[PDB]
Amino acid sequence: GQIIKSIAAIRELHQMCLTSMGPCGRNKIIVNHLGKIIITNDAATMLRELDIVHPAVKVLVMATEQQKIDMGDGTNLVMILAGELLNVSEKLISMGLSAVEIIQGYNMARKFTLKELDEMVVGEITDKNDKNELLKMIKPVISSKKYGSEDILSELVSEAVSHVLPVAQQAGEIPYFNVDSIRVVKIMGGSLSNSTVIKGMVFNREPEGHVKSLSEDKKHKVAVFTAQEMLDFSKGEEKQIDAMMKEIADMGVECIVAGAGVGELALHYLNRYGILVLKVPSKFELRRLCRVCGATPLPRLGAPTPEELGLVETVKTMEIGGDRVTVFKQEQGEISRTSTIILRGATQNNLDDIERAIDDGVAAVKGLMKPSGGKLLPGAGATEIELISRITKYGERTPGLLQLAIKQFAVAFEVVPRTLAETAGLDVNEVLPNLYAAHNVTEPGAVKTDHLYKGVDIDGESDEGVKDIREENIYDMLATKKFAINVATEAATTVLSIDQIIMAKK
Amino acid sequence: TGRQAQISNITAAKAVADVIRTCLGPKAMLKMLLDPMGGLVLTNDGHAILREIDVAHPAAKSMLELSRTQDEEVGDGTTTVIILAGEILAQCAPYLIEKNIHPVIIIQALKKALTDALEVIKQVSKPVDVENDAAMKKLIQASIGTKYVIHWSEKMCELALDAVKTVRKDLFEIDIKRYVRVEKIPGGDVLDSRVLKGVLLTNCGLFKVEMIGDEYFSFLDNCACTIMLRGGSKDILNEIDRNLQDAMAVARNVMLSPSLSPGGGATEMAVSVKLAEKAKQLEGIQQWPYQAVADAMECIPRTLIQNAGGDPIRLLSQLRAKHAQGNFTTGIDGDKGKIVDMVSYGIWEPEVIKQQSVKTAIESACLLLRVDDIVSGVRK
Amino acid sequence: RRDAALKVNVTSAEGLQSVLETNLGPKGTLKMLVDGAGNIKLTKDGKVLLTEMQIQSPTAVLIARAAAAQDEITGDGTTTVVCLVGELLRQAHRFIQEGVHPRIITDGFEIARKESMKFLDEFKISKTNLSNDREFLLQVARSSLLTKVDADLTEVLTPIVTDAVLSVYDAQADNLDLHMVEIMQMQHLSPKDTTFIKGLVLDHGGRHPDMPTRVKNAYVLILNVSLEYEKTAASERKFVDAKLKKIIDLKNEVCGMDPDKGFVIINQKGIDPMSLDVFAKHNILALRRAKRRNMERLQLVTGGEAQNSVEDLSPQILGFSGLVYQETIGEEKFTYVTENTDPKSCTILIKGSTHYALAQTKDAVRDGLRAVANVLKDKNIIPGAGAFYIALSRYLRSANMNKLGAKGKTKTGIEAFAEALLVIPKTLVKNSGFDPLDVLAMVEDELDDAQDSDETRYVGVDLNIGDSCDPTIEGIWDSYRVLRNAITGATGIASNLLLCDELLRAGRS
């Protein structure tokens, strides 16, 4: 009522995410009750919008939150790995093996995998500020994320990270990384070649009264803010608003930021004194506005303190995507980080997949800076084949009942190379011997042989099966794999620990 | 239809094989059947089980003719060989209906498996001389341990071994043993027998006619042997032929294959551990369906563990380690489920027992894989 | 996945012992069977009950077929074998359902099976059957009739069976069940008025009412050729008078002085009543339409011989009888002849209301005569009154390091067999409304007190007062060969359900 019932739901979702991962991977369409259509290959976003009536399989749904908080990438790899571990364990259940040795078998092999990740690591090379290093991290995401164009998207991200880079060369001990430092804007129409990068951050709003530049003012000033008796309130407000707006114009403040409701009488004087105003800033825009500009949102409607004010070297309100838009565009010299990357595309759904792909690229820098390093792992399924030889060796080194769990734990690794063959329509049985041909019988006496040095890249080479991953720069994140086996083991043992569903007053 | 039709065929042989799992060994269990007519048949022999049951699955009907071929050779213990044909079908579930492995590729792997199996059969080969009557006496008594005629076999099995050697001799040694004529006399004691060398109807010793309610006695001197059996009961004559007339297969198998293999389901233990080692040297696409055959070989000895009330997972851990390391002469005790080796177990079976078992299993398994689907309603 | 059908098959099978639970002991009630034609039979015999009763569960139907072999083994109280294996299965559900394998626990009962005969070997008691002491003979009849009929019919049929078992006997222990077969079944008087006849009885008689109703010495002669002519008219009747002349000459030749003797005629065909008037003066009895089976038994009892022609008559072929008397009941005249030349075969005259009450006595004396016959055949007799239920259970209960023979789960099978033997004695007092727990205090605990006295005592269970008794004083005894194959056969019959993994529905379509 549970195991067989859950596996029926597992094989469903496992086959779904099987075609998501890989450069040949596929997307899916999800329609909610409101009619919203979302196309993405991410498993965390997929299961989030879907409504599942089976509480048993929901363990893998909530398990994605552990991966998104720790890393945010490799979500498709976790669902495929965790889903396969429960599929290969079905044979041990029919054999009569209790879950005691099954849970202990996965936990024993999990510690053995972490020991191999430190021995099998290569490509230290330890360079933060190189533009080529930013390309080596963002290129491999074409497997799990959108593979459409890796040439243009890799260049815009590398120029944006280097623009917001704190520098502080040698040892600067830089804390407080900015995840929000990268932002993209969806613009309907145009191709990807029309996209570019701006030193400042941009946003979608339209000017009304002035549209003038005003950035030529050579260190200008910007402010930030948080029957005759019937005319007593009317004339009373006209005298106060006039005096408050005049003192601002006397100080030479070209643009102000108003985060509250702006009346009709307020906008009347702004056109005469030539003062720009922002209309209804959101919550996430208000936090980015005060931190980058460095101005205090004084709630007083009067003249703000001229000592602390915002400054923008160069800003233009003219057209960008064909419509006039006022933006925050700036220059790194006199003002801080958090630039943006402007995207151009015809399909709005394709811009969403690029947004999720760039957001995962921010975690690549997080994985390098927060621990000692992100290191490297063989990409395109070349890491799993390295573990198959190690886990198989551990089965003979530890005789006992764990050999049945160790055997099924190594067989579960066959889904990763099958992913490349299934999504490409090629026979997995033809590519399988080409994968074993790298290590042959044993490893040659040379260091970093074709098993470690080369990998599986299938375009025209499907007959050969092996390709160098060094020139292709195809690698897997080490912090992701460490957290992948942790979430997969915790989620697999959780389903096996389920006994009976309990309903309380319903 | 297509792959879905083959799934019903795998479960058809799997459901039949699961019934005969407990039909092997001296601890073999029994099965009760209920027909729509209301008759009940309770027996431990799978021969009459497959004949009386009319199965709706067309794939299970092929196993009925296979049982007739296996029973034509020996018939005792060879009924459970069908399990091996059923385990291979269930072994293809991760491959055939999942990896989409082509059946001929599996059949080609079974061709290399059947060839490598005969090499393992020659590895456990233990020749023994047939001139010793005491060595051949304990050989025919192997199949007697499943019956209460054990202590009765002292005056029984000695008559069968002496009659076959007269009609066997040599030519190779191929000859016809069917010239023997066995006569059964109801009533009396089982210990009473008749020793007669000749033809029952030059310088003849004597001629006499005894007194028997059936017929008289006549002696014919030649220049051929008959057996007169006196049963200890009325209907016991049916079980006497099973322990003597049907026991002639042991005398036929020792002449064709003088070698001895571990008896009581202990032979395939050394075969499964050796087949896994031969798979690592293949290094090909077929290695996975070839190595998976060893997983189907270890399911047969689990029938003894299911009969001995043990744990097949934990017990076979030490058992498979003995055959793959210490020696291939080790075996499994079926009675108590113990590690006692076949050396002190005192029972050995000819190699042809497992030869014809694996040969007929692979030939029956490939034919089931060559069937794409099954259609009905042709109205022939 | 496993079996799980074993607990379902026995659950439907447990209903058989619940029906037969009240069939045990002399305090039990008889079961009634009725057909669609109106015939009603009341008996406790398991062969008739299990045959007519159709159980919806086929599992209990095949087990009921094994009770046919209990006829020669026991024949009286075969329900004990069925109720013994019923609780024997329930004791396995407390084990097998907990993960114990059926084959492992089965070997535990197979060991205790053979070991039960070794304990029974020293448990049996041998008696001297050559003395023909009526003290032990009347007790064996009480071990049966009390478990069949009431106390009123007990004192009636007891000397009837006692005189029947003593009629067939020899110093060489020669006994034949086919020697005594014919049993007169009549509807008249009451079942309590039945008597024991010392000779054979025929169901036919003469058509002449004036024939002598009492004869001192009668000479029985079997006549083959019919006395009355059939077909080829005045010369046909003269041939009959010529045959009657030889009968008159033979009557006066044997005894010509005192008319204290008589002659009996047995004819296969009818006899003219006009010719029977001559026999009235000579006191000669005649018969007609005699069956072949009835005439064959007269040569071995009365001593006569079949004669074809009446022209040759000799006293050598004439038998004799010590007492002959006839009685006319309704329109069917019967002849009672006893004290024949070879009076080793007798008959039991049974009268009653209808065949409903007659079926109780017929089945009681049939197996009752065979049960007491096994006492003379097998001198070893087993103490009854439930003495061996506790004894055989106590020997296997105490094992420790002295005598065990098993290990692990096989050791628990011996303990389960000791508890399986106690269901019968608890059932005997349950049918009478008594608490079996308090009975064991005065019975089971009494054996432990006599054990410390260095004396061998076997104490039974009295169902009348619900207290202990002495099987020797009460007179309840069972033969050795009866309970030998019953206890051993019960293990084999119960094994058929223990050896069944699951019940599969399939067969010829």
Residue numbers in the entry:
A (entry chain Q): 26 to 251, 270 to 549
B (entry chain g): 16 to 186, 196 to 225, 350 to 371, 436 to 592
C (entry chain z): 14 to 245, 263 to 539
From the primary publication:
The TRiC/CCT complex assists in the folding of approximately 10% of cytosolic proteins through an ATP-driven conformational cycle, playing a crucial role in maintaining protein homeostasis. TRiC is an ATP-dependent macromolecular machine that facilitates substrate binding and folding through ATP-driven conformational transitions.
TRiC-ADP-S3, comprising 6.0% of the population, appears much more open than S2, seemingly in the middle of the transition from a closed to an open ring. Meanwhile, its counter-clockwise neighboring subunits, including CCT6/8/7/5, expand outward in a coordinated manner, with the apical helix retracting up to 18 Å. During the transition to the partially open S3 state, the density corresponding to the CCT4 N-terminus is not detected, most likely due to the conformational dynamics induced by the dramatic upward movement of the subunits on the CCT2 side. This indicates that the CCT4 N-terminus may retract into the inner chamber to participate in other functions, such as coordinated ring opening or substrate release.
